[PDB]
CSV table of C-alpha atoms and ligand atoms in Angstrom, one decimal:
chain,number,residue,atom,x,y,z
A,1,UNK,CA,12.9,27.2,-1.3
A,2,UNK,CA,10.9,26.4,1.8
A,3,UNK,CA,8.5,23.5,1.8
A,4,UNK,CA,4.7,24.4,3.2
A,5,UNK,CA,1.3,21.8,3.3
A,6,UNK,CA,-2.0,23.1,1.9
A,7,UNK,CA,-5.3,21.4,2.6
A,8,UNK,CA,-8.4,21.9,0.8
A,9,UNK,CA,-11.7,20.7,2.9
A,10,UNK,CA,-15.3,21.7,2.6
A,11,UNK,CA,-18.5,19.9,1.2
A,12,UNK,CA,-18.4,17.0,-1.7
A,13,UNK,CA,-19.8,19.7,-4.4
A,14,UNK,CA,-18.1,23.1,-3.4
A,15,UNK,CA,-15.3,22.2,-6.3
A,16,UNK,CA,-12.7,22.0,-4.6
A,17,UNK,CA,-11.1,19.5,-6.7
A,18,UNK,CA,-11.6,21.2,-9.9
A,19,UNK,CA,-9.6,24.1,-8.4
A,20,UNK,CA,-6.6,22.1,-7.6
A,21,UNK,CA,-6.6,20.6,-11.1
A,22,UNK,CA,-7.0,23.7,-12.6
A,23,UNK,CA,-4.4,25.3,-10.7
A,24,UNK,CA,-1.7,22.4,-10.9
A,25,UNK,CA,-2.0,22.0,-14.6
A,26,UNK,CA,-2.7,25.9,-15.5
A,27,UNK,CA,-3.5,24.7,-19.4
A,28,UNK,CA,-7.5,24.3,-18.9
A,29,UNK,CA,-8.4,20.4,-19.1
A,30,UNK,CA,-10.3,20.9,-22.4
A,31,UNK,CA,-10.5,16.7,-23.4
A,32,UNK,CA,-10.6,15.6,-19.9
A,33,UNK,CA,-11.3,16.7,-16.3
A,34,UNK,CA,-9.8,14.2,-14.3
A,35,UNK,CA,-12.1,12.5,-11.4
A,36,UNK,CA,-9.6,12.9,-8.4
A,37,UNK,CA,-6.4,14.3,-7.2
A,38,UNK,CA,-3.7,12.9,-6.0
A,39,UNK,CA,-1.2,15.4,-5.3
A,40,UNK,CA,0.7,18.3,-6.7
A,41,UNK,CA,4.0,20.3,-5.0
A,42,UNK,CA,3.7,23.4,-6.7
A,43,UNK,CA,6.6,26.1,-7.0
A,44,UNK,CA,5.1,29.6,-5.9
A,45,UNK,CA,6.9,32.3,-5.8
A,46,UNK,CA,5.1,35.6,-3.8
A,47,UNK,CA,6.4,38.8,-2.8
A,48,UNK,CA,10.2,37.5,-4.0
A,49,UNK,CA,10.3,34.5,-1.1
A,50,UNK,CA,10.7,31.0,-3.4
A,51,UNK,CA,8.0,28.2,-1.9
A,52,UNK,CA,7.7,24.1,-2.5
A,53,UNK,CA,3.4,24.4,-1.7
A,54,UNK,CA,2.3,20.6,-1.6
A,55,UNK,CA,-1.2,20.6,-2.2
A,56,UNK,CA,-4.0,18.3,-0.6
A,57,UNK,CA,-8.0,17.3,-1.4
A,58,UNK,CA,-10.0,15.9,1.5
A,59,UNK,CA,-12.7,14.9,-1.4
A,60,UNK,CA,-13.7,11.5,-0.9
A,61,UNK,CA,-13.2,11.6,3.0
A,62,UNK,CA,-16.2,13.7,3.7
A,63,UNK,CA,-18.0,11.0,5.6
A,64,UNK,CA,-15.0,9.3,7.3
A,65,UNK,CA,-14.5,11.0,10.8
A,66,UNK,CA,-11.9,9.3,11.5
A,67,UNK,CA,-9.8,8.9,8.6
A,68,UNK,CA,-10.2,12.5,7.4
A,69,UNK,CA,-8.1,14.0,10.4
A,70,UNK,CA,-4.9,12.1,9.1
A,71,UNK,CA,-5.1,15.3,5.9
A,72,UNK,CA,-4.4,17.7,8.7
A,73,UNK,CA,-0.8,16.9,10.3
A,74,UNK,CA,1.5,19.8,9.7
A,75,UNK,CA,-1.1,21.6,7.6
A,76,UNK,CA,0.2,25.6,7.4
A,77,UNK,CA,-2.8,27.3,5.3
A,78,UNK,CA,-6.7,25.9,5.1
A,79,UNK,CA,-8.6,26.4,2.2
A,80,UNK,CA,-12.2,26.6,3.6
A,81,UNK,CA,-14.4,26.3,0.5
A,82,UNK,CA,-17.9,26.5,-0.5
A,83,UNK,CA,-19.7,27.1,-3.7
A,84,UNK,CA,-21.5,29.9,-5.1
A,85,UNK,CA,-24.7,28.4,-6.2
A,86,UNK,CA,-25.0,26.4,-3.0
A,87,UNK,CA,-26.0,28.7,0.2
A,88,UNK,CA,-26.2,25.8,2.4
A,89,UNK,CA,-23.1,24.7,1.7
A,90,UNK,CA,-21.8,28.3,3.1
A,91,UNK,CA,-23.7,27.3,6.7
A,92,UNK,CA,-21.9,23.8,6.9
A,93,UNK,CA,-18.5,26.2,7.2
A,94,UNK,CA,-19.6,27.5,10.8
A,95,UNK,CA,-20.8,24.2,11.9
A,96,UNK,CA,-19.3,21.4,10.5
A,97,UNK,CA,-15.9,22.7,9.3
A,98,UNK,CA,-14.7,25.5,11.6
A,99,UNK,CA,-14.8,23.8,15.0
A,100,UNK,CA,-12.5,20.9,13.1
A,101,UNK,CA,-10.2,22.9,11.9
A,102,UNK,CA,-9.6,24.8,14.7
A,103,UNK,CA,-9.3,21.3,16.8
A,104,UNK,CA,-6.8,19.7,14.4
A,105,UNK,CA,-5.0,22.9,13.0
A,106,UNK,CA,-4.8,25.6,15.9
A,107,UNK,CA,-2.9,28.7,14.4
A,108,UNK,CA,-3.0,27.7,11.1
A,109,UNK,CA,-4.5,30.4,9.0
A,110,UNK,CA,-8.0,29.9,7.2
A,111,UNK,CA,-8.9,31.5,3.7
A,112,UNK,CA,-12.7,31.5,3.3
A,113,UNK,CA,-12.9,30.8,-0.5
A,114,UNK,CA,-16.4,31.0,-2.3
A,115,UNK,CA,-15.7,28.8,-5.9
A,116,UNK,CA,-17.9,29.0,-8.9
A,117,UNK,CA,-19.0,33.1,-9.2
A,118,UNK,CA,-19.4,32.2,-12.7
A,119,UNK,CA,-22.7,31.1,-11.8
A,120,UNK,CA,-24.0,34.0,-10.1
A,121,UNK,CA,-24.6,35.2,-14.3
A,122,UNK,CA,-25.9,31.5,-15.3
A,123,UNK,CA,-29.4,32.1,-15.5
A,124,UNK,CA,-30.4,27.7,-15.3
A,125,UNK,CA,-28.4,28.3,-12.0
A,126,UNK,CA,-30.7,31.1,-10.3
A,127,UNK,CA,-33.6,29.5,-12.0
A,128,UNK,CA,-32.9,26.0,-10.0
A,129,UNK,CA,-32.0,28.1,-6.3
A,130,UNK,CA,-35.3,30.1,-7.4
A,131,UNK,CA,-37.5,27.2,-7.4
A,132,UNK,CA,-36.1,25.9,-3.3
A,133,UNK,CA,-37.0,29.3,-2.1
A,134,UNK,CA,-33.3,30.5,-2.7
A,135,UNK,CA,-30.7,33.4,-4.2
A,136,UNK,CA,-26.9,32.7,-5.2
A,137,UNK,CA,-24.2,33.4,-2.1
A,138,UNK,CA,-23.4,37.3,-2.6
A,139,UNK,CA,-20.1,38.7,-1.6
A,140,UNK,CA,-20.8,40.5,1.3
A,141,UNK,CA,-22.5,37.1,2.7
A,142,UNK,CA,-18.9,35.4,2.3
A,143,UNK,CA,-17.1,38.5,3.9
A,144,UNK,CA,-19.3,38.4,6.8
A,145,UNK,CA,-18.6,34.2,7.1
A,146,UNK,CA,-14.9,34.8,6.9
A,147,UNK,CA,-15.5,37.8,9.4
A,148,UNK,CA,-17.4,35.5,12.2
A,149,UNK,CA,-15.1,32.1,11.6
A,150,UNK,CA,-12.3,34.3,12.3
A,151,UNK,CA,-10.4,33.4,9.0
A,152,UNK,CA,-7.7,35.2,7.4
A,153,UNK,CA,-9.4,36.3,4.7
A,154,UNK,CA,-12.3,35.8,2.0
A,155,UNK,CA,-11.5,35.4,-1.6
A,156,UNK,CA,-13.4,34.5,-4.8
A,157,UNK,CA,-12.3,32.5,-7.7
A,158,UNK,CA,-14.2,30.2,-10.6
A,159,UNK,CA,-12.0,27.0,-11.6
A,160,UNK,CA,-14.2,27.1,-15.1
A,161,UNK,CA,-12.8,30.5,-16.1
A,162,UNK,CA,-9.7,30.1,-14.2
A,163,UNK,CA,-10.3,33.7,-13.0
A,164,UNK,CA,-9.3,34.4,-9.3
A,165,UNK,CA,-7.1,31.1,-9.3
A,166,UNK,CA,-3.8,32.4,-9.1
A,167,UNK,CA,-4.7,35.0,-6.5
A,168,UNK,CA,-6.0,32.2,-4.0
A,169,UNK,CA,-2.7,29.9,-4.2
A,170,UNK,CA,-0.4,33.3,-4.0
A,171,UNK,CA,-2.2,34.3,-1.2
A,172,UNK,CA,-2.2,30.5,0.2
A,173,UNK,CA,1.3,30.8,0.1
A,174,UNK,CA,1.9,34.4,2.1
A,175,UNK,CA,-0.5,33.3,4.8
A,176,UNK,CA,2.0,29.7,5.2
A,177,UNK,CA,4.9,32.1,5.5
A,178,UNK,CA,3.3,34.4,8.4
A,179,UNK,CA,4.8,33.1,11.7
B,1,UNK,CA,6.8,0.8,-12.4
B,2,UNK,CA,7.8,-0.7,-15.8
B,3,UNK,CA,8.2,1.4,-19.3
B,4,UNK,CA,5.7,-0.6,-21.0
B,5,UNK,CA,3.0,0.2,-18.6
B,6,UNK,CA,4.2,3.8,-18.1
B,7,UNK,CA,3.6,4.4,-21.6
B,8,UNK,CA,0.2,2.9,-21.9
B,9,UNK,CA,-1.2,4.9,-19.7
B,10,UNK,CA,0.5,8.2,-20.2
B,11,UNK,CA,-2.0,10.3,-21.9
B,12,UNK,CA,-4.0,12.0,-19.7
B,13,UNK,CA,-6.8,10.1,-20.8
B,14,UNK,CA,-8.4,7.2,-22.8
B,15,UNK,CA,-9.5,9.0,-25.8
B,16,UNK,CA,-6.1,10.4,-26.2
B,17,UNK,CA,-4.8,7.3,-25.8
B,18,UNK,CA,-6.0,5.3,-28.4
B,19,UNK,CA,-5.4,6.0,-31.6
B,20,UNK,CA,-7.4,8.9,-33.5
B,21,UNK,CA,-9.3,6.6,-36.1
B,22,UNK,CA,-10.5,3.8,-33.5
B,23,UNK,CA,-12.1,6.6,-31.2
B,24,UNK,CA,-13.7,7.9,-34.2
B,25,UNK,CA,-15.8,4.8,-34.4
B,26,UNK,CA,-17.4,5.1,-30.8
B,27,UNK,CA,-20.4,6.6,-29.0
B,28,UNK,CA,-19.7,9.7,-26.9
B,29,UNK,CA,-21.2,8.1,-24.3
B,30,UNK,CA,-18.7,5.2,-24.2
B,31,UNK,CA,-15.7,7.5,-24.9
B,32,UNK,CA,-17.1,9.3,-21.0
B,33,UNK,CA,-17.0,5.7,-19.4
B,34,UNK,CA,-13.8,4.8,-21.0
B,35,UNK,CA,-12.3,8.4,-19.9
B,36,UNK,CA,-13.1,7.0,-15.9
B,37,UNK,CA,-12.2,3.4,-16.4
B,38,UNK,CA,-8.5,4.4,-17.9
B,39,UNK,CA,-8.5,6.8,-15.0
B,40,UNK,CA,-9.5,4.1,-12.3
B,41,UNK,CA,-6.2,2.0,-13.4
B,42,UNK,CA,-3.8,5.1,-14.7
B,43,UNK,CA,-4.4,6.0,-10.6
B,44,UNK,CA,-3.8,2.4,-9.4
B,45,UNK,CA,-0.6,2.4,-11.7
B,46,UNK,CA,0.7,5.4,-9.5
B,47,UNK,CA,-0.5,4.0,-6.2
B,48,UNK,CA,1.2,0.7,-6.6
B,49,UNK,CA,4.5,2.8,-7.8
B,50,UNK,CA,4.3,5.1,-4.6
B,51,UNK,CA,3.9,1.5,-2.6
B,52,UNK,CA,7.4,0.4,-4.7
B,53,UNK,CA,9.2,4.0,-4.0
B,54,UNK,CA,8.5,3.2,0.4
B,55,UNK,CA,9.5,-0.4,-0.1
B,56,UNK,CA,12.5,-0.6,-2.7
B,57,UNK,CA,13.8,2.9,-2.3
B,58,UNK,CA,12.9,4.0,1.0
B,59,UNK,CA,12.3,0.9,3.4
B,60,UNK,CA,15.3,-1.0,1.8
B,61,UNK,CA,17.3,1.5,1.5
B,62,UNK,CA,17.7,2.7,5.1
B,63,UNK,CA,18.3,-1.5,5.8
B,64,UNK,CA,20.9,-1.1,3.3
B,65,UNK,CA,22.5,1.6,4.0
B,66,UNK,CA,21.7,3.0,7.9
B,67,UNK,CA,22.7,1.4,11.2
B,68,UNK,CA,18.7,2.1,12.2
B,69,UNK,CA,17.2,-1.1,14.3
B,70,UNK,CA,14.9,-2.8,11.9
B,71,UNK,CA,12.5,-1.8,14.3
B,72,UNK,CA,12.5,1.6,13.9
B,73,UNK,CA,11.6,1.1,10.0
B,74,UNK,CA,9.2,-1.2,11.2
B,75,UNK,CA,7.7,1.8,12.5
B,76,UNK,CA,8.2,4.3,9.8
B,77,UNK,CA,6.9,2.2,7.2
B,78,UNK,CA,4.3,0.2,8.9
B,79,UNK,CA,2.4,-2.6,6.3
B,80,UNK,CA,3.9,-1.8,2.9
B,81,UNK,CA,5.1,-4.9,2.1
B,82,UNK,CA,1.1,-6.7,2.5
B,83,UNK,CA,-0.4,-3.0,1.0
B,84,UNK,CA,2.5,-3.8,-2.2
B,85,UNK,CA,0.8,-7.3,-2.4
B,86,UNK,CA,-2.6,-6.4,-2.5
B,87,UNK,CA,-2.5,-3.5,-4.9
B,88,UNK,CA,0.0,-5.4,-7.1
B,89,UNK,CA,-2.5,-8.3,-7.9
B,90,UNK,CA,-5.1,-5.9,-8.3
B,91,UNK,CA,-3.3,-3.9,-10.9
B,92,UNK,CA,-2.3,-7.1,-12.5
B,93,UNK,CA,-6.2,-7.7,-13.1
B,94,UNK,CA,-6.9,-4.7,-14.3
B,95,UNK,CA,-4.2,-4.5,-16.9
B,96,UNK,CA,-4.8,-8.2,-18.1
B,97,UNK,CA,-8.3,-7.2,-18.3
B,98,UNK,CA,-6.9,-4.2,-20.6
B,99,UNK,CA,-4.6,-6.7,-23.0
B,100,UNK,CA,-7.4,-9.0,-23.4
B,101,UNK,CA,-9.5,-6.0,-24.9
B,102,UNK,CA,-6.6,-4.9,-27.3
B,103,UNK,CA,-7.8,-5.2,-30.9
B,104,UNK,CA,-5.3,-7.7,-32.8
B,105,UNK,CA,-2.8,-5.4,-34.8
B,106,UNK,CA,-2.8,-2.8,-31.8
B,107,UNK,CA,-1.0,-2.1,-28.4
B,108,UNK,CA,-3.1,1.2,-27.4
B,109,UNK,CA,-6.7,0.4,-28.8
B,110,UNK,CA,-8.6,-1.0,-26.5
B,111,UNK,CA,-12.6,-0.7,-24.5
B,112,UNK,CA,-13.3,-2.7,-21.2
B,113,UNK,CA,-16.9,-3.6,-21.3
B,114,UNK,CA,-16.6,-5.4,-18.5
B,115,UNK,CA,-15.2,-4.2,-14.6
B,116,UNK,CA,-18.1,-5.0,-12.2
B,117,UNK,CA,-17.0,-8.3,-11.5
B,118,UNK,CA,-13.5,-7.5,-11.2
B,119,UNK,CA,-14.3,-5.2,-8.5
B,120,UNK,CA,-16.5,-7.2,-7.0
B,121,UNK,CA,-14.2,-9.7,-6.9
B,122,UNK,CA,-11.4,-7.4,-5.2
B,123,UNK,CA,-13.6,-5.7,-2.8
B,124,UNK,CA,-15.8,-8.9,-1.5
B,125,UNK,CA,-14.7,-12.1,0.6
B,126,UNK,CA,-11.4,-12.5,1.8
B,127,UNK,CA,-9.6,-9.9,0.1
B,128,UNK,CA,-11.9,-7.6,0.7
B,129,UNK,CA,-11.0,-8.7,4.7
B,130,UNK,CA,-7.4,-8.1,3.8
B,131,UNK,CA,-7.7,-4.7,2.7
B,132,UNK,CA,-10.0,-3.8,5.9
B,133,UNK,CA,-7.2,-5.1,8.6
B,134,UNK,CA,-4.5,-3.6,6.1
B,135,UNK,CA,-5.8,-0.2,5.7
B,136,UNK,CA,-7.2,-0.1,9.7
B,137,UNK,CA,-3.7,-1.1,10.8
B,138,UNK,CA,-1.9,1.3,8.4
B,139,UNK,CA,-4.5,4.4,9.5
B,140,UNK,CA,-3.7,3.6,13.2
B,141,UNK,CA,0.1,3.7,12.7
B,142,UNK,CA,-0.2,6.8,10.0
B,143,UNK,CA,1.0,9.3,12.9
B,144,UNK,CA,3.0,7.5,14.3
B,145,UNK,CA,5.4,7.1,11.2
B,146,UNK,CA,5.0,10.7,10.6
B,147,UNK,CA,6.5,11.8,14.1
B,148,UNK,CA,9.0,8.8,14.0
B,149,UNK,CA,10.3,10.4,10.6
B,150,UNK,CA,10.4,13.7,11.8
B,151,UNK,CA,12.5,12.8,15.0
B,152,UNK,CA,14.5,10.8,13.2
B,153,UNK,CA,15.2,13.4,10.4
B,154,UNK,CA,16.1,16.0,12.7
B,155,UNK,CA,18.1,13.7,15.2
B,156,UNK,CA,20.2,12.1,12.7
B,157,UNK,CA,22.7,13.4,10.4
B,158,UNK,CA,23.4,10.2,8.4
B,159,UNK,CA,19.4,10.0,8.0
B,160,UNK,CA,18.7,13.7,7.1
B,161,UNK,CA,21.5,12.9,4.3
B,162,UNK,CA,20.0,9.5,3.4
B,163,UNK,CA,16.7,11.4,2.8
B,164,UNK,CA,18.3,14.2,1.0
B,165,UNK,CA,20.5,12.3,-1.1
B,166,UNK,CA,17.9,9.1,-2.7
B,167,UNK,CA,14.7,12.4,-3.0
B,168,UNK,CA,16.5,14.3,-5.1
B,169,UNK,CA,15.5,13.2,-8.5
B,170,UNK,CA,13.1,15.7,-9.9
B,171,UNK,CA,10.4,12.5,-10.3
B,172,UNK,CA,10.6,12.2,-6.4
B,173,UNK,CA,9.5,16.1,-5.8
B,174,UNK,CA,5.9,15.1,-4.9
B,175,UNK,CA,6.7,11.6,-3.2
B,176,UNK,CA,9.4,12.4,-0.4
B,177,UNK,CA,8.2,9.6,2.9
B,178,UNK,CA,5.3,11.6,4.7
B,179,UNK,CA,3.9,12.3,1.2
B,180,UNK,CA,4.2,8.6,0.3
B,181,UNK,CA,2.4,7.7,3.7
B,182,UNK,CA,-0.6,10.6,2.8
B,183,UNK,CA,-1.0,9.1,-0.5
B,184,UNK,CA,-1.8,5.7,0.6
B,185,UNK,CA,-4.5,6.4,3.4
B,186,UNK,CA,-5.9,8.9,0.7
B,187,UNK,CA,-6.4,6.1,-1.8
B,188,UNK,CA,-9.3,4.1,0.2
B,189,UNK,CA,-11.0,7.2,-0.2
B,190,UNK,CA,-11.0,8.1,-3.8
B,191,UNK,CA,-12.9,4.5,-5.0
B,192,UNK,CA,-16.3,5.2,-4.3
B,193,UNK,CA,-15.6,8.6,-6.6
B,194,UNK,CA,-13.9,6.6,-9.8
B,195,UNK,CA,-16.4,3.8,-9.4
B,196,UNK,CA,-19.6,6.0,-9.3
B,197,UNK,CA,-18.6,8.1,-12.5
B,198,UNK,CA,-17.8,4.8,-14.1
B,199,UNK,CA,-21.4,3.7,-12.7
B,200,UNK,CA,-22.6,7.1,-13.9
B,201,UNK,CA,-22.0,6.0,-17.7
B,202,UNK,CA,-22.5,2.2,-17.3
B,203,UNK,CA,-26.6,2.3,-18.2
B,204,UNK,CA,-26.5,0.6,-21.2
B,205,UNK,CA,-25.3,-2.7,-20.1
B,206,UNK,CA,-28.1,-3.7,-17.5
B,207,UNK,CA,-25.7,-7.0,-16.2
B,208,UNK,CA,-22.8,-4.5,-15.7
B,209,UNK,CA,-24.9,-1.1,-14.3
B,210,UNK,CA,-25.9,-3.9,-11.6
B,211,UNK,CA,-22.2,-5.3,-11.4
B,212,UNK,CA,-21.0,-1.8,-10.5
B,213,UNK,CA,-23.6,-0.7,-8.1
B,214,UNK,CA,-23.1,-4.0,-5.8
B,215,UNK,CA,-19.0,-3.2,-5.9
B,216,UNK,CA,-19.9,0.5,-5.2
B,217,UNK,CA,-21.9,-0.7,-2.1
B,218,UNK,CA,-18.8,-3.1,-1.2
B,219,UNK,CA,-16.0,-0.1,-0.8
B,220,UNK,CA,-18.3,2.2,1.0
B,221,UNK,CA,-18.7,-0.9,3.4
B,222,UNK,CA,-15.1,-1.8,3.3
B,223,UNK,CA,-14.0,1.9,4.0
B,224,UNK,CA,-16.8,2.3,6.9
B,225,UNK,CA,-15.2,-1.0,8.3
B,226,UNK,CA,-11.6,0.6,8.3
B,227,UNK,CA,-12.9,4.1,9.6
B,228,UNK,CA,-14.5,2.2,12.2
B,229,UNK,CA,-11.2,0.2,13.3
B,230,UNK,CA,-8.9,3.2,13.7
B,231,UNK,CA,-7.7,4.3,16.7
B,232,UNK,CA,-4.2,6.9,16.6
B,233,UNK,CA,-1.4,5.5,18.1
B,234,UNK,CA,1.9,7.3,19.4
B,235,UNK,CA,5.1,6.7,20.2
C,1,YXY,N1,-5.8,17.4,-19.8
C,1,YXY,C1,-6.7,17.4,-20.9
C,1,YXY,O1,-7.9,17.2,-20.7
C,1,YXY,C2,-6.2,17.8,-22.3
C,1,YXY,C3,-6.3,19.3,-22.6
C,1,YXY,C4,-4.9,19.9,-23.0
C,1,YXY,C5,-3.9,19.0,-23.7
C,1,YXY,F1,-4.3,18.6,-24.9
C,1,YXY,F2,-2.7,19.7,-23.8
C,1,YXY,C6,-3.7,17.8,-22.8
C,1,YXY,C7,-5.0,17.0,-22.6
């Protein structure tokens, strides 16, 4: 049962906190979603290799340059996310994220993941994007992100449904193995 | 921690907490600010155990049972016994500001009208310039205990089997020494989040909507002051 880190880090409203709560308790926070995480060491096991994956938020360090890099130390897989109903979230990952990553975590695999699809159907949500000149991220627009960041690969889940959750923390999990 | 706490604030959250009946005679809207309040000290609860788990287990531990240079755990364990002090009295206030809410006849019924001032309180004046040269000294020897551990762990026999013997406890799976070290430069971070949901439902109470926008204001200064007052140190 090897042990591997996971960070999560992207803007303060791509859900990336939701995800990990969703993911670490499985049985959907109907009463209460909690406010932050703390931490979770989650057993995964993928392709029949058994892995310990402690998982990590950067929420709340968004604006702290200098505290934020202390997430990063021995990191093995990135989650790089952005939300769905927020396209300018989606050019913050080239620009603000990417050249970070890269600077703190050389070699360490980046998954591109584009959270909340369920509100490419919510009609309130393409109403609101409609009204600042705007359209929903669509899936080729994430491939061709994860295509000129250089990530591993682009995946797209919704914490609300849970759908596409499992996939992104199995797939986590293979790209910490690959050395 | 201690049982007694433990169970108070093992429900995942306040309205599952309290008994069925009581929350049956609130407003939604209070049940929500409840809900982040009870989170607010459910995640100091946790913090201040993680800060017992380096110091008791961990930290004394080695002294106890190592031939390590008390030095070296200086090192590895930089400020925990100051960080241990200043979260314990503020997890005292918070849970004494908790009991005196209890409803006579009950131990889990409870609602804290009240938490502005004991934030403000916390986060302003001297203890507020505690927590700054605290938190910017811990940040700045945060790598350096991360590197010292790993040398250490895979220099050392009698240290690798220290480490493997007092983690082994299921309850210890997400709190082995880097994790610890994580959790507490992590913790600055997520107060301005529980304090502004709190904020978020505290409109009714114009003396306390006031009371929680001045502490909100405090902590982003505070954590601004520590970010500022970094600088990485190595060994
Ligand atoms: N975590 C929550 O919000 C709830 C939903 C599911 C449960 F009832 F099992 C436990 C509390």
């Amino acid at each position: 049962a090897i042990r591997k880190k996971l960070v999560i880090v992207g803007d303060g409203a791509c859900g990336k906190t939701c995800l990990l709560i969703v993911f670490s308790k499985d049985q959907f926070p109907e009463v209460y979603v909690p406010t932050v995480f703390e931490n979770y060491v989650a057993d995964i096991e993928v392709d029949g290799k058994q892995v310990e994956l402690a998982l990590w938020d950067t929420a709340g360090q968004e604006d702290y340059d200098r505290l934020r890099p202390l997430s990063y130390p021995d990191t093995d897989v990135i989650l790089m996310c952005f939300s769905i109903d927020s396209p300018d979230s989606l050019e913050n990952i080239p620009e603000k994220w990417t050249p970070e990553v890269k600077h703190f975590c050389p070699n360490v695999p980046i998954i591109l993941v584009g959270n909340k699809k369920d509100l490419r159907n919510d009609e309130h949500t393409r109403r609101e994007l409609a009204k600042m000149k705007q359209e929903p991220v669509k899936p080729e627009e994430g491939r061709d992100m994860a295509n000129r960041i250089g990530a591993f690969g682009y995946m797209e889940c919704s914490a609300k449904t849970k759908d596409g959750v499992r996939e992104v923390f199995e797939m986590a999990t293979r790209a910490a193995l690959q050395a | 921690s201690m049982e007694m706490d433990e169970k108070d604030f093992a429900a995942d959250s306040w309205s599952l907490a309290v008994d069925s009946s009581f929350l049956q005679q609130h407003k939604k809207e209070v049940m929500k600010q409840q809900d982040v309040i009870y989170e607010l000290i459910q995640t100091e609860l946790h913090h201040v155990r993680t800060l017992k788990i380096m110091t008791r287990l961990f930290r004394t531990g080695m002294l106890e049972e190592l031939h390590l240079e008390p030095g070296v755990v200086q090192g590895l364990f930089p400020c925990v016994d100051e960080l241990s002090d200043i979260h314990t009295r503020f997890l005292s206030q918070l849970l004494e500001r908790r009991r005196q809410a209890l409803c006579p006849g009950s131990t889990r019924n409870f609602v804290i009208h009240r938490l502005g001032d004991l934030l403000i309180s916390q986060f302003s004046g001297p203890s507020a310039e505690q927590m700054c040269k605290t938190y910017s000294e811990f940040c700045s020897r945060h790598s350096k205990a991360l590197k010292l551990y790993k040398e250490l762990y895979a220099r050392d026999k009698r240290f690798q089997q220290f480490i493997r013997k007092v983690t082994r406890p299921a309850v210890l799976k997400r709190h082995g020494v880097q994790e610890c070290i994580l959790l507490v430069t992590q913790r600055i971070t997520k107060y301005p989040l529980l304090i502004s949901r709190i904020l978020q439902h505290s409109h009714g109470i114009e003396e306390e909507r006031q009371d929680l926008t001045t502490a909100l204001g405090l902590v982003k200064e505070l954590l601004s002051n520590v970010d500022e007052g970094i600088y990485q140190l190595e060994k």
